């Protein structure tokens, strides 16, 4: 299984209500604290040696909105995710040198923060489709690693 209409609906609903300005920074800043290895690519963002500094860092906040919005293209092209992301995939691989396992870690953070935002509305069926969508994107982000 690929996409059922239900899945299509849920994804569509979640993104039409996404508050990028809230979710973004929170997801990325949560990721940097819980999986500190992820800080490997934020040299120059300023001091990230403590929880509090990370939550307040404006560069983190901004980069988080950047990453979150990076999901828009997947949403718009649900039947062509691999092709769509190929370019971002090559970038992360050859210019950034990001360990694709970090892709997965961030997605988990995205899911936890979105979950805290929708509360009860983040049902088991929503969680299912959302994770399925993130897992397809993460797959695509790591295919151009050679």
């Amino acid at each position: 299984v690929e996409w059922t209409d239900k899945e299509r609906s849920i994804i569509s609903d979640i993104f039409s209500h996404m508050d990028y300005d809230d979710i973004g920074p929170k997801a990325l800043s949560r990721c940097l604290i819980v999986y500190p290895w992820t800080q490997r690519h934020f040299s120059g963002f300023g001091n990230l040696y403590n929880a509090e500094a990370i939550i307040g860092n404006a560069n983190v906040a901004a980069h988080g909105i950047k990453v979150l919005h990076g999901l828009d293209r997947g949403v718009k092209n649900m039947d062509n995710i691999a092709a769509t992301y190929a370019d971002l995939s090559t970038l992360h691989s050859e210019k950034l040198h990001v360990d694709p396992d970090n892709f997965k870690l961030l997605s988990d953070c995205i899911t936890i923060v979105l979950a805290a935002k929708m509360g009860h509305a983040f049902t088991a069926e929503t969680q299912g489709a959302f994770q399925k969508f993130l897992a397809v994107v993460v797959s695509a982000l790591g295919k151009q690693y050679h």
């Binding site: 604290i33 819980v34 899911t111 009860h120 969680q127």
Partner: protein, 142 residues
Amino acid sequence: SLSDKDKAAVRALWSKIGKSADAIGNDALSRMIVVYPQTKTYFSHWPDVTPGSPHIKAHGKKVMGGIALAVSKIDDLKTGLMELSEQHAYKLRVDPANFKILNHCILVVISTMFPKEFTPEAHVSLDKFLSGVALALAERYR
């Protein structure tokens, strides 16, 4: 390993959410069976492997009872959870990969239920601790 800071963090959180353990338990397990249908392999003895079945409900409170145990034996999980380890190793034979799966569902549930309380800092320590629990349950396998 858990630091003192981790221990204080888990202890303080549990102090706060522990009362809703049965709910968390049901929620979590229900998510685990929906989002990760392969874990259903272990519950084929039940006819009602469905979100919130009386079987899920009941089991959810048995599992969260083991988490309540771990919080209280938080200084020595290995010894504290021995008997749970034997059950899982010899009698159920549960692949320990499944522990990570449920743990993730528990974090999602706590998150949905107690957003103000589940900060990034509480998140690091509870994640270190569940990992802790997973390793203690795996103790008697081999």
